[PDB]
Scaffold this active site. Structure first.
Site, mmCIF file in Angstrom:
data_model
loop_
_atom_site.group_PDB
_atom_site.id
_atom_site.type_symbol
_atom_site.label_atom_id
_atom_site.label_comp_id
_atom_site.label_asym_id
_atom_site.label_seq_id
_atom_site.Cartn_x
_atom_site.Cartn_y
_atom_site.Cartn_z
ATOM 1 N N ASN A 1 1.471 9.937 5.838
ATOM 2 C CA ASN A 1 2.539 9.206 5.162
ATOM 3 C C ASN A 1 3.786 10.091 5.056
ATOM 4 O O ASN A 1 3.867 10.989 4.201
ATOM 5 C CB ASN A 1 2.047 8.750 3.792
ATOM 6 C CG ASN A 1 3.071 7.950 3.070
ATOM 7 O OD1 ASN A 1 4.097 7.556 3.674
ATOM 8 N ND2 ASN A 1 2.836 7.703 1.769
ATOM 9 N N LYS B 1 6.578 9.266 4.037
ATOM 10 C CA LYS B 1 7.403 8.776 2.935
ATOM 11 C C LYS B 1 8.859 8.655 3.385
ATOM 12 O O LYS B 1 9.150 8.246 4.515
ATOM 13 C CB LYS B 1 7.175 9.670 1.729
ATOM 14 C CG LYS B 1 5.704 9.733 1.321
ATOM 15 C CD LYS B 1 5.455 10.647 0.129
ATOM 16 C CE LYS B 1 3.980 10.549 -0.330
ATOM 17 N NZ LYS B 1 3.740 11.316 -1.587
ATOM 18 N N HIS C 1 0.489 1.807 -2.481
ATOM 19 C CA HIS C 1 0.685 3.232 -2.667
ATOM 20 C C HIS C 1 1.167 3.527 -4.085
ATOM 21 O O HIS C 1 1.950 2.773 -4.664
ATOM 22 C CB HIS C 1 1.691 3.793 -1.662
ATOM 23 C CG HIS C 1 1.727 5.292 -1.651
ATOM 24 N ND1 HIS C 1 2.622 6.019 -2.406
ATOM 25 C CD2 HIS C 1 0.936 6.197 -1.027
ATOM 26 C CE1 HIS C 1 2.391 7.309 -2.234
ATOM 27 N NE2 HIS C 1 1.379 7.444 -1.394
ATOM 28 N N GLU D 1 -6.072 7.690 -4.362
ATOM 29 C CA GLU D 1 -4.991 8.594 -4.716
ATOM 30 C C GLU D 1 -5.255 9.144 -6.108
ATOM 31 O O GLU D 1 -5.039 8.431 -7.096
ATOM 32 C CB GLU D 1 -3.651 7.862 -4.684
ATOM 33 C CG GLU D 1 -2.923 7.930 -3.376
ATOM 34 C CD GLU D 1 -1.602 7.175 -3.405
ATOM 35 O OE1 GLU D 1 -1.590 5.943 -3.665
ATOM 36 O OE2 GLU D 1 -0.571 7.832 -3.151
HETATM 37 BR BR LIG Z 1 0.196 10.006 0.609
#
Ligand SMILES: [Br-]
Ligand code: NA
Ligand code: NA
Ligand code: NA
Ligand code: NA
EC number: 5.3.1.1
Lengths: 244, 238
Positions: free
Chosen positions: B7, B9, B91, B161
């Site tokens: 990821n 981001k 997320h 997460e």
């Molecule tokens: Br992540």
């Protein structure tokens, strides 16, 4: 210069949008008119590649830092890197569907401008606010927060969205739009400069079509449009021609 | 298949992401590993063009209908049209910075899957939830909302997460509970075939001992996905 912005929202694929861009590339853009297209974020790159340089590209939103742990956002620097020169900020859909506050929108405005993008800054009151009589209050507060974060109005366009006419059962006449635009233009003249009032474009972000665009553009303080659905259609060329 | 997601981001530009993609294209990916990269949304197209086909592309977010009056959003249709085959949904940044509710994430999952995209569905408890002992409750309700909107687990990856942070044992402890939840509430078959990847801080140093945990089936890498050591993480099982 007359400002005609097309907001494609969450619509199109490479094929349909390539056809649209083909129609727009073929259209004669008036000398006194500046045209901007806002494609879905996944197509900013694609659209800038296919669109003629005479049409500018806008992102539909951006975040407030240049890089960070913000999964799903993009920064003004990425927009610029893709060749786009504007960003739409404070769109009614961001404020009411996704709960973007005034404070967050102002901080996005300050960052987009500091990084050298132009900003199409959207404001407008909802139905219940208008009917309660506080159109004044809502629109002035939203414009205040934007102005607090604007140091150079050269790169800014203000878009009034009559959110109270979006699917609510009521619609805005040209006179009603001119009413609100004049009240906004008084603010800028009152709280910035006389020159900025003459300079700054207040564009209309309500329902506009080929059949209505000329009458609305004729309103003294309507200086352009932020077009919705018609922006995906050949009819957008008629709205580009609103002043001719 | 060992799943390694990166990821990126909200980082990178065409030039710097081009260098990152060059390093990934050159690296040889082990046999039994699926590698996915999630670029910033303005670069989904660009990333897919520059990455070797062996690496799949994922969007970082999407909305819950195919087209509409949602300025600033993209749909799974547009993700697919850009050559991406995955979307990260739920997320922790989307939930806790942008306030995306579980209901909305469930609707997003349902629509992404119906459109043929794979989904990397993210869950996790905050530190105050942990310190109140309700880690299990939080991730169990979050997973339940996803599971209620999943009709084909074939296409789904669950990413835990630990927003609260984490040692490898704490990770395996959560992953094992999630696997048990799947077994009891969905099916034994889904519990055995669904990959639960760890989404906490993963580095080239901590990757191998995390991968060795029996219920840690891969990673969803954050910062390290922008650096060469992502290659080491891709090789965590060698
Ligand atoms: Br992540
Ligand atoms: Na505002
Ligand atoms: Na004043
Ligand atoms: Na006018
Ligand atoms: Na393992």
């Amino acid at each position: 210069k007359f400002f005609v912005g097309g907001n494609w929202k969450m619509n199109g694929r490479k094929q349909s949008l390539g056809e649209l861009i083909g129609t727009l590339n073929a259209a004669k853009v008036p000398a006194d008119t500046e045209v901007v297209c806002a494609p879905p974020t996944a197509y900013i790159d694609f659209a800038r590649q296919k669109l003629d340089p005479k049409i500018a590209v806008a992102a539909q939103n951006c975040y407030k830092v240049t890089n960070g742990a913000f999964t799903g956002e993009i920064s003004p620097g990425m927009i610029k890197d893709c060749g786009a020169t504007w960003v739409v900020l404070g769109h009614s859909e961001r404020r009411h569907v996704f709960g973007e506050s005034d404070e967050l929108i102002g901080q996005k405005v300050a960052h987009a401008l500091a990084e050298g993008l132009g900003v199409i800054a959207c404001i407008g009151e909802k139905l219940d606010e208008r009917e309660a009589g506080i159109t004044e209050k809502v629109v002035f507060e939203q414009t205040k927060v934007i102005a607090d974060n604007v140091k150079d109005w050269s790169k800014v366009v203000l878009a009034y969205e009559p959110v109270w006419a979006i699917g609510t059962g009521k619609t805005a006449t040209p006179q009603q739009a001119q009413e609100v635009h004049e009240k906004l233009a008084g603010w800028l003249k009152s709280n910035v400069s006389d020159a900025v009032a003459q300079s700054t474009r207040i564009i209309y972000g309500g329902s506009v079509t080929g059949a209505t665009c000329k009458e609305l553009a004729s309103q003294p303080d309507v200086d352009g449009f932020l077009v919705g659905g018609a922006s995906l259609k050949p009819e957008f060329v008629d709205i580009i021609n609103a002043k001719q």
